[PDB]
Amino acid sequence: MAGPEGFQYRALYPFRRERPEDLELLPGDVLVVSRAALQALGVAEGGERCPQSVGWMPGLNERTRQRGDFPGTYVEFLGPLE
């Protein structure tokens, strides 16, 4: 309606937080990321659809309700936040 507020990723494989400031990934669980975060990383418009090309990204996890940087290699792409 108004526009894309952000994008959603989804963890495919379970990996425990290596560091307290690391974000945990569980299979099937969704991670919510805003446009501001991706733009702060310097992502090209149409690159976010390939998270492994961006690397570690700051977002919100559903199962843990925690916030931090997750390795965007074990995650799939869901779509834009509208």
Which CATH class for the 1-82 domain? mainly beta
* Ranges of each domain in the chain: 1-82
Please give the method by which this entry was determined.
NMR
Report the chain's C-alpha Rg in angstroms.
12
